[PDB]
Amino acid sequence: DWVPPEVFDLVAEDKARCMSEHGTTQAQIDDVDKGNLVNEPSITCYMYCLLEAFSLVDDEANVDEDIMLGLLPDQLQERAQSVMGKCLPTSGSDNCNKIYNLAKCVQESAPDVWFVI
Ligand SMILES: CCCCCCCCCCCCCCCCCCCCCC[C@@H](C)CCCCCCCCCCCCCCCCCCC
Ligand SMILES: [Cl-]
């Protein structure tokens, strides 16, 4: 498991805030974490929200690739550059839909490393 245990407490405050703002359930998060996602704002806006909280996207859901790479471990760098080559730039009807399209693209491209918190 590439995910470090320190991240969980780090994201806790923003996670609670993002769920409250968007009407997100933990069941929805569990579902996307397992690779199942639909274009429901309560989960897609949650994903945008948490990314934004950690400066991974801007006000139009453009991804900050350098920040993203900075967060991932060494054994994931080339894979990430490859996945971002396929999945960026983001597109969609709004910020939440941009993140929906991104999620699927990434989950489809790297299912074994996918996770959502
Ligand atoms: C190569 C595989 C890619 C990763 C698989 C999907 C996970 C992507 C998660 C995005 C950031 C993950 C980094 C979390 C671990 C970093 C630990 C460092 C601790 C200090 C920083 C803590 C915070 C900066 C964590 C930020 C967590 C944000 C979670 C966002 C959840 C929604 C993501 C789904 C949307 C698609 C992501 C699309 C972005 C990914 C493109 C390229 C890999
Ligand atoms: Cl982008």
Cβ(61)–Cβ(99) below 8 Å: yes
- All domains of the chain, ordered by start, with CATH? 1-117 (1.10.238.20)
**Helix, strand, or coil here: 11?**
coil
List the beta bridge partners of residue 63. 57
- What is the C-alpha to C-alpha distance for residues 34 and 116, in angstroms, rounded to an integer? 9
In contact, 106 and 83? CB cutoff 8 Å:
yes
For ligand 1, is residue 84 a contact (CB within 6 Å)?
A: yes
Instruction: Please compute, for residue 13, the number of CA atoms within 13 A of its CA located in the half-sphere on the CB side.
Output: 3
Name the residue at shortest CA distance from atom 20 of ligand 1: 7
DSSP, collapsed to helix, strand or coil, labels residue 81 as helix
Give me 71's structure tokens.
């967060």
Q: Is 114 in the pocket of ligand 1 (CB under 6 A)?
A: yes
